[PDB]
Ligand binder design. Structure first.
Ligand code: XAN
Ligand code: XAN
Lengths: 272, 272
């Protein structure tokens, strides 16, 4: 009858990190959805994490759960980790605290000191315990974020740490709308992902589950889409918030109204 | 620029309480909104609480914030405590972990062992430090909840503790729709609230701010409506979620759709 949960940011240095976060002085209130407040991480902050994930920016599901990467992008990432034998021993952090409000106008402010400095503080903290043995960045901006981190004083000691830059999980659906082109690019992604998994498997010497590598096909299998674990969510959040069915979307008659609203809908089958 | 927050349930005995909570085996899944998961509390759990508030059941605002009494009822309660000099030294718990559906019935189940046993555990925990000097129940069901606690072995030792049953803060708008009856019923409530404050002022000997009691008039004044404090909310939640303007409602084309959906709308003025 036991249900696990994440108990948040009560221990240092995370406690101070979450009380002194940057707002409109670092993140432009127009090009960033700072109106929803910062979503900080996902995963273990007790030091048991073995792989670090660097994502890009949060979406609307994350805006409700208050943990990053809990949508479709997250479930694809869970399956990627599962292939390495990693089931719970991970920590994820985003390139941006807030969501980009574009227009994909994310790279417009990638050089803001107030933004990079604060992210580096989170990198310094999660890497501090020295237990991370692999780092994976999602997309090109996370890639630039990690590489800019290794060029800083505090991060210079991680140039040797196993690292793979892979394509952002939502690239196929972001690059085209036709199911045909989307399916073709997915095959291209899964092929590139297979190359990264082969390079990381020998570096991950402490998996939650010993696992022989099984590569992706041309398309995703349902088993390669893994639900977020209960242990990642705050206390009390229902099981369907970490299920396979979408439940949050932005809704508005125009752009101004759509930005101001998130609609939450419980999947069918929960309520008798 | 420091923003405080509640870091949840990482310390015992609360950690185990939030990992082993009751579901459909104690709360009937039709007469209770268990689909949204449990909302546990609001306030201090470090032992600095001086006043215990016992509420009834959570609403749609609480379902997003994941703390109880953050809606209009909560803001009226804040102002009630503010008159006793209490600004942050409090802890609040609901009679039910979930929000009844309806209802109609709403009290069919007030005596279910699976419900009361678990609530008593939360009572025992918050009261353990022996720092609570006054208890206030909201509504008739919260009143019976406290009385059921005093009839238990572990709770018999609190029959001596100063206690006041006041009317549930959202009763006037619950009793009638015409603004005339609402204003009339409010006057009756504020009269009963003033009666409770007269009885509790000498019992609250450890206020965060020494304050001379100012009784209510015939209607609520803007100053007697106090916004929930940042320290009560999880890390990252934006300031407007603890503002004076409603931003959450259940909405649907029929009863079934309304139960499955919550609408979140950012107040005007937040986004530039
Ligand atoms: O937290 C997130 N990080 C991401 O990189 C991303 N992409 C889509 N959705 C996302 N959520
Ligand atoms: O947490 C809550 N407890 C209550 O008793 C209540 N009444 C209205 N809204 C409420 N929220």
């Amino acid at each position: 009858m036991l249900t696990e949960f994440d108990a948040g940011y009560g221990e240092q240095p995370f406690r101070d990190l979450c009380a002194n976060y940057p707002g409109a002085e670092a993140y432009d209130p127009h090009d960033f959805r700072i109106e929803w407040g910062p979503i900080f991480h996902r995963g273990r902050l007790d030091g048991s994490a073995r792989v670090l994930i660097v994502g890009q920016d949060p979406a609307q599901h994350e805006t409700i759960v208050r943990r990053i990467l809990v949508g479709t992008a997250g479930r694809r990432t869970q399956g990627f980790l599962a292939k390495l034998g990693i089931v719970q021993s991970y920590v994820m952090v985003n390139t941006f605290l807030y969501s980009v409000y574009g227009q994909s106008g994310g790279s417009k402010h990638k050089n803001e000191p107030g933004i990079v400095d604060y992210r580096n503080k989170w990198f310094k903290a999660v890497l501090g315990p020295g237990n991370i043995e692999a780092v994976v960045s999602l997309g090109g901006l996370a890639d630039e974020a990690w590489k800019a981190w290794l060029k800083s004083s505090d991060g210079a000691a991680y140039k040797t740490l196993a690292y793979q830059h892979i394509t952002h999980p939502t690239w196929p659906e972001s690059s085209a709308h036709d199911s045909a082109t989307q399916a073709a690019n997915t095959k291209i992604m899964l092929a590139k992902w297979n190359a990264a998994l082969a390079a990381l498997a020998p570096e991950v010497k402490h998996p939650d589950v010993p696992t022989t590598l099984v590569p992706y096909g041309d398309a995703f299998k349902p088993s390669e889409l893994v639900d977020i674990i209960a242990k990642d969510l705050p206390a009390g959040l229902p099981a369907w918030m970490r299920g396979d069915t979408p439940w949050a979307v932005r809704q508005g008659v125009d752009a101004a109204a759509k930005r101001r609203t998130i609609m939450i809908t419980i999947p069918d089958g929960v309520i008798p």
